[PDB]
Symmetry: C3
Subunit: 185 residues, 3 copies
């Protein structure tokens, strides 16, 4: 089936390089069909919450990716809005996004990004910078092209499948989609 | 003294390889005496909560290890039941169990396992697969037998001691029990 | 401007090597001016909460560092007091303090240390032992002096700046203060 993905750029910071960066990476990473629902909003908690609820409840998105507003400054409230609309928390996503980003963002531990589930959709908070967005998703390789640290998207296809969503496949040259034998078609 | 351990297999998934796998590993790892209280239950939150409370409060277990029901799927509610009966959270156990399992489970970050304390007992959530159960507890070694990443059980004996429980010792060939000079007998 | 730092030793454990160890390290690490507000208190939750509130609200501290009372034992309640006075949690600080300390404290995962924000101040919980206090802050190097794992203080100057505090600089021979081009003066 077609995967429906919501993309939210919290433009609190123009070149909203946020949406375009996600569109570019996803188009390169996915081999199965998908459709996008894009939104550009300010860093105001109530508006972010409404936007996430609109995309999951009304637009029936299977996956929602946000960019921006995840730092320590008082204005940054994307993770707060994300936890507020969640039905269940996925601690490993925030933890590992920070371990992955320790490789390309010296102050990565200052981020408060989370991954949560609302209904049957997965919502992940990503950085605002395009380079950081792609490195978090795809991970880190060496000069030869070998994977040193797997990206966060390597576990996304299987998570969507466990949430009873569409069967998602990726281009291994970009990112390999992990899946146990008891889940491969 | 004898260590009392509760083993809970949330058979929501037969071969309940869960209880047997824990019995096998513990018997090999511990050099001090222990007794087991085993339970096989469905993946229903209220039943898991009652079982954990029965084992800690009524059976006076010092340590409780659970297997199964820790994924993102809505049915999986072991971590939810565990947090519900907790008096205090131990964040490092869930975090490090996921770092350890990143070595043998490609999608390890999808787990929501926790470690908590209820009264004076420690409760840890483990995977459902026998191989993953043992690797989390014992950690990872190289072909030579050298420890690359210490297992989660390396810190369990000292934690029980700090919780005023029995003095627990392990077979170093399986797993070494860490303890500061100010705690060694 | 001058950075105001509160130092709290939860002497629940004399040689309160806690305050002195922080005074020694900070004096060596900082190249910009600072002033200290020191306190030595027992491991009693209400007293720790009052002390943190006194230092942030009344003494206008930009940064507060605590030492001691972060283990699993029931008496240890520094992290509980810290979360109780917080306006916002910084998950990456607790997570990374535990990853850093995995190098010098075998049972590092037993710690429940957190990093939080109250008003515009950052509060971080550190170990009780002087050696562990300094290694957490400065990180780990090799025999040659190369940084293998960056200390937690490498991200503190930038965090204070994002919280609208004074411009803090450090001696790179001790610890380098990370900062993006869009923040360097």
């Amino acid at each position: 089936a077609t995967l429906r993905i919501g993309l939210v750029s919290i433009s609190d910071r123009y070149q909203d390089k946020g949406i375009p960066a996600l569109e570019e990476w996803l188009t390169s990473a996915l081999t199965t069909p998908f459709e996008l629902e894009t939104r550009l909003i300010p860093d105001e908690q109530a508006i972010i919450e409404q936007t996430l609820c609109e995309l999951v409840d009304e637009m029936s998105c299977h996956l929602v990716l946000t960019t921006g507003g995840t730092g320590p400054a008082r204005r940054d409230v994307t993770p707060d809005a994300t936890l507020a609309v969640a039905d269940r928390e996925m601690p490993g996503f925030g933890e590992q996004m920070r371990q992955i980003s320790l490789h390309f963002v010296p102050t990565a531990i200052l981020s408060r990004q989370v991954g949560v589930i609302r209904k049957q959709a997965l919502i992940l908070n990503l950085p605002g910078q395009p380079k950081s967005i792609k490195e978090t998703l795809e991970g880190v390789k060496d000069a030869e092209g070998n994977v040193v640290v797997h990206g966060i998207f390597a576990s996304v296809p299987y998570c969507i499948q466990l949430l009873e969503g569409p069967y998602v496949e990726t281009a291994p040259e970009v990112v390999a989609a992990f899946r146990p034998k008891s889940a491969r078609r």
